């Protein structure tokens, strides 16, 4: 009494991973054209998203594609004769390098930071030093045209896929999300690189949202997504005079020649009241996950400068703040915050950022970078929009010690690509009907199976049918053609709603028509009839083969 | 277009016709897909009658 009817263009999707393409790389369109999916609830998992791995690869590839046509400082991996800067933090280094003409030499003097030098002999009169890691790999000088101001990147879908945003204002990142929306592109995501503190991010809509893969171990990074930003202003007060020498045929090396005025240390200012209010609210939100525990914030217990300090790019200069006056607090279950009196204060927390020039890029090891100096001084403002915390494991007397963390740059991108999931549309499906043979994309995803069988020409047209994109264009074409070939083999070519001669077997589903078309959505139906598609498809092609042979026999009768 | 059949098929080329009916293809294509959706639903209703 019920027969298999093949539908094409149903609002059904499966989880999948594709090579989404940036679009600052291709001009973006007026709006993302967001279609809110009513009555749709999807399972997100921020800690298993692929959009993060793709963004990581894109960033470690754009960065390494801007330093390729730039001067490599091979001629400067020479013995330096360095004295104290009394005309330590900085040294006045003299060296003999190679000049533009490949037969002469050149004597130069530059001021380098002590963190950029490694002694060749007992450190004290001049002492011998070389540039850090220059004898282990090549140091590439950044071209003056390299843009150190993060540019928002929009990730847009290839044909055949959709980005499912999550609009629950209090979502942490993992688990079921309702009020799911479909978008074509993401918002503008800045590739901001910062350790311990997330800078220039998006704020939480409602409150501080503690998120972690598992708040029970001491390995997973805890991301604190703030609702109100704390403003940080960082400066390098020294008035630097930049000099340059040529080290080859068109290869210009830039360095600090002298400093005008006195020598002052770089620093960052965070208002005490705003910081300690932020840490109070984060300590009360972390008390909701670790009940009856004492919550303490302390400085990092170890590691390299890139993770024990707050590392950030300020107008190209790479600062490294101590951040040990910030993370010094105790919050107990009684609700009193130990370092009190910081709610009526006018003080400032001065963090002594150090400056480094030979920056060990990412952790590639075999590739460093030289950040050229900028004449004059530098001041940068930024918004602190989140924290990266690591919890201390082991036995304890009911006290948690959340110490800053970072270094892994995926956890800096898992705090803006948290709401986005990539899915692949499955426009081809089957359902029982009484039929015998003889708006926007996914807009009806949450509608019943009888109201989504009218919006088929809208999810069908939006299938839109170097290497990273071209392979996904070819893949989308292959998937489209495989679906068309399936329809053709079944005798359904050229139709979106196709009635067949295959009877419905009650073992596939025993629901009545008023329990399917009127009460269920296409996603629930796909989740029901999924183990049986390898039987239905075979029956459909066998029935079409029988119909084709019967048709040629009838057409040869006369 | 208000031209008669003998003014279109017999007198005009396809380029002139494209230059004439070009602002209206976003209406004609929508009408064509709506008519096909109606025909497909009517066909499944006729094929379920019996």
């Amino acid at each position: 009494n019920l027969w298999v009817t093949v539908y094409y263009g149903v609002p059904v999707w499966k989880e999948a991973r594709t090579t989404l393409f940036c679009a600052s790389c291709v001009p973006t369109d007026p709006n993302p054209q967001e279609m809110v999916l009513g009555n749709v609830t999807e399972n997100f998992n921020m800690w298993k998203n692929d959009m993060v791995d793709q963004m990581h690869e894109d960033v470690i590839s754009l960065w390494a594609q801007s330093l390729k046509p730039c001067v490599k400082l091979t001629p400067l991996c020479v013995t330096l004769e360095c004295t104290q800067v009394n005309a330590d933090e900085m040294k006045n280094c003299s060296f003999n390098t190679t000049t533009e003409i490949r037969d002469k030499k050149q004597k130069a003097y530059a001021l380098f930071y002590r963190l950029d030098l490694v002694p060749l002999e007992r450190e004290n009169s001049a002492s011998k030093y070389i540039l850090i890691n220059c004898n282990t790999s090549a140091i590439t000088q950044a071209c003056p045209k390299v843009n150190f101001d993060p540019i928002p990147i929009h990730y847009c879908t290839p044909a055949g896929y959709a980005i499912l945003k999550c609009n629950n204002k209090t979502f942490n990142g993992t688990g079921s999300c309702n009020n799911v929306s479909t978008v074509q592109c993401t918002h503008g995501i800045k590739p901001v690189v910062s350790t311990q503190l997330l800078l220039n991010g998006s704020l939480a809509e409602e409150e501080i949202i503690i998120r972690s893969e598992n708040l029970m171990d001491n390995v997973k990074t805890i991301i604190v997504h703030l609702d109100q930003s704390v403003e940080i202003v960082c400066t390098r007060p020294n008035n630097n005079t930049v000099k340059s020498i040529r080290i080859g045929p068109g290869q210009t090396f830039y360095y600090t020649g002298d400093i005008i005025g006195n020598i002052r240390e770089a620093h960052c200012n965070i208002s005490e009241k705003k910081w300690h209010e932020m840490l109070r609210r984060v300590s009360e939100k972390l008390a909701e996950h670790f009940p009856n525990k004492t919550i303490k914030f302390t400085s990092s217990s170890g590691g390299d400068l890139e993770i024990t300090t707050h590392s950030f790019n300020c107008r190209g200069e790479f600062f490294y703040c101590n951040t040990s006056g910030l993370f010094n607090s105790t919050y107990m279950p009684n609700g009193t915050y130990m370092p009190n009196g910081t709610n009526n204060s006018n003080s400032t927390i001065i963090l002594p950022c150090r400056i480094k020039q030979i920056i060990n890029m990412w952790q590639e090891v075999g590739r460093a970078m030289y950040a050229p100096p900028i004449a004059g001084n530098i001041t940068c403002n930024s918004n602190i929009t989140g924290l990266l915390l690591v919890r201390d494991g082991g036995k304890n007397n009911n006290t948690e010690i959340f110490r800053p963390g970072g270094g892994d740059m995926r956890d800096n991108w898992r705090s803006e690509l948290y709401k986005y999931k990539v899915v692949e549309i499955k426009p081809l499906g089957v359902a029982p009907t009484r039929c015998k043979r003889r708006l926007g994309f996914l807009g009806a995803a949450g509608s019943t199976m009888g109201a989504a069988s009218i919006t088929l020409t809208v999810q069908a047209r939006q299938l839109l049918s170097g290497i990273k994109q071209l392979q996904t264009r070819v893949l989308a074409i292959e998937h489209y053609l495989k679906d068309q070939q399936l329809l053709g083999i079944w005798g359904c070519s050229g139709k979106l709603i196709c009635c067949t001669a295959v009877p419905w077997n009650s073992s596939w589903s025993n629901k009545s028509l008023t329990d399917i078309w009127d009460n269920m959505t296409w996603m629930q139906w796909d989740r029901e009839v999924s183990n049986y598609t390898g039987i239905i498809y075979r029956l459909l092609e066998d029935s079409q083969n029988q119909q084709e042979r019967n048709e040629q026999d009838l057409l040869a009768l006369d | 277009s208000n031209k008669s059949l003998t003014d279109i098929w017999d007198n005009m080329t396809w380029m002139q016709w494209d230059r004439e009916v070009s602002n209206y293809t976003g209406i004609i294509y929508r009408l064509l897909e709506d008519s096909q959706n109606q025909q497909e639903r009517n066909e499944q209703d006729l094929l379920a009658l019996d």
Partner: nanobody
Amino acid sequence: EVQLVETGGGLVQPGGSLKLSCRASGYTFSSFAMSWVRQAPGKGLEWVSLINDRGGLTFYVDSVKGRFTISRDNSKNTLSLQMHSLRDGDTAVYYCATGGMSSALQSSKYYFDFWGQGALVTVS
């Protein structure tokens, strides 16, 4: 309690035209395939025409093909039947009925579930 009220009918002379209309209330209108059924005085019931729930498909008894038009308006919750020529054999009470067909995504409704009170059509 659904209510089908047929507002129309009267007297015509052989060769004339007459329109009947039927208003529905108490249930979702655009989900039922409506029909018309004639009862001549002293005789039984005879089916005249059927229209689908969407209005796109119409079916008629052979004796009225080419003369009767059945139409429905799902925004006004009205059904109408417009008759031409009106022969003497068409004199009858015309009942508005709900049923006779389904949309292929619902169970078979090959029966006339809800009837109206009946319009009287006289040809003389």
